[PDB]
Curated annotation (Swiss-Prot), chain A:
Transmembrane segment boundaries: 35-49
Record function comment: Ionotropic glutamate receptor that functions as a ligand-gated cation channel, gated by L-glutamate and glutamatergic agonists such as alpha-amino-3-hydroxy-5-methyl-4-isoxazolepropionic acid (AMPA), quisqualic acid, and kainic acid. L-glutamate acts as an excitatory neurotransmitter at many synapses in the central nervous system and plays an important role in fast excitatory synaptic transmission.
Tissue expression per record: Detected in cerebellum.
Compartments in which it is found: Cell membrane; Postsynaptic cell membrane; Cell projection, Dendrite
Family label: Belongs to the glutamate-gated ion channel (TC 1.A.10.1) family. GRIA4 subfamily.
Note: The postsynaptic actions of L-glutamate are mediated by a variety of receptors that are named according to their selective agonists. This receptor binds AMPA (quisqualate) > L-glutamate > kainate.
Superkingdom of the source species: Eukaryota
Subunit structure comment from the entry: Homotetramer or heterotetramer of pore-forming glutamate receptor subunits. Tetramers may be formed by the dimerization of dimers. Interacts with EPB41L1 via its C-terminus. Isoform 3 interacts with PICK1. Found in a complex with GRIA1, GRIA2, GRIA3, CNIH2, CNIH3, CACNG2, CACNG3, CACNG4, CACNG5, CACNG7 and CACNG8. Interacts with CACNG5 and PRKCG. Found in a complex with GRIA1, GRIA2, GRIA3, DLG4, CACNG8 and CNIH2.
Modified how: Palmitoylated. Depalmitoylated upon L-glutamate stimulation.
Domain topic, free-text comment: The M4 transmembrane segment mediates tetramerization and is required for cell surface expression.
This protein's encoding gene: Gria4
Protein name as annotated: Glutamate receptor 4
Swiss-Prot record, chain B:
Protein name listed in UniProt: Voltage-dependent calcium channel gamma-2 subunit
Gene name for this UniProt entry: Cacng2
Organism superkingdom: Eukaryota
Role, per record: Regulates the trafficking and gating properties of AMPA-selective glutamate receptors (AMPARs). Promotes their targeting to the cell membrane and synapses and modulates their gating properties by slowing their rates of activation, deactivation and desensitization. Does not show subunit-specific AMPA receptor regulation and regulates all AMPAR subunits. Thought to stabilize the calcium channel in an inactivated (closed) state.
Species this protein is from: Rattus norvegicus (Rat)
TM region positions: 11-31
Quaternary structure (record): The L-type calcium channel is composed of five subunits: alpha-1, alpha-2/delta, beta and gamma. Interacts with the PDZ domains of DLG4/PSD-95 and DLG1/SAP97. May interact with GOPC. Acts as an auxiliary subunit for AMPA-selective glutamate receptors (AMPARs). Found in a complex with GRIA1, GRIA2, GRIA3, GRIA4, CNIH2, CNIH3, CACNG3, CACNG4, CACNG5, CACNG7 and CACNG8. Interacts with GRIA1 and GRIA2. Interacts with MPP2.
Subcellular location: Membrane; Synapse, Synaptosome
Similarity comment text for this entry: Belongs to the PMP-22/EMP/MP20 family. CACNG subfamily.
Length: 49, 43
């Protein structure tokens, strides 16, 4: 058959799952340390006092 | 080795608080015992 001129140029692309904006949590300033450290600091604080 | 801590873990964490608070209350009783002795032995 004899095609006509392309009316839509395309190709092979890459599709991935759209990511999320990862809205920071309210209490995210605690993230640098683990929950165990934060809990142990309170225990250490009480003990020292 | 997701994990979580149970009540038995928090039973020893609560016991720590109760123990430190009892230790403080016992130290006050000791300071109270000696304060009375000093005050009685002053007048
Ligand atoms: C002076 C010693 C204590 C100073 C205050 C530190 C405040 C942090 C304690 C609360 C955070 C407990 C952690 C649970 C939340 C989490 O990180 O998942």
């Amino acid at each position: 058959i004899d095609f006509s001129k392309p009316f839509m140029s395309l190709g092979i692309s890459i599709m991935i799952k759209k990511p999320q904006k990862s809205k920071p949590g309210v209490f995210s300033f605690l993230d640098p340390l683990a929950y165990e450290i934060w809990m142990c600091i309170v225990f250490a604080y009480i003990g020292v006092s | 080795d997701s994990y979580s801590y149970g009540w038995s873990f928090y039973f020893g964490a609560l016991s720590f608080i109760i123990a430190e608070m009892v230790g403080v209350l016992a130290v006050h009783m000791f300071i109270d015992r000696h304060k009375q002795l000093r005050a009685t032995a002053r007048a």
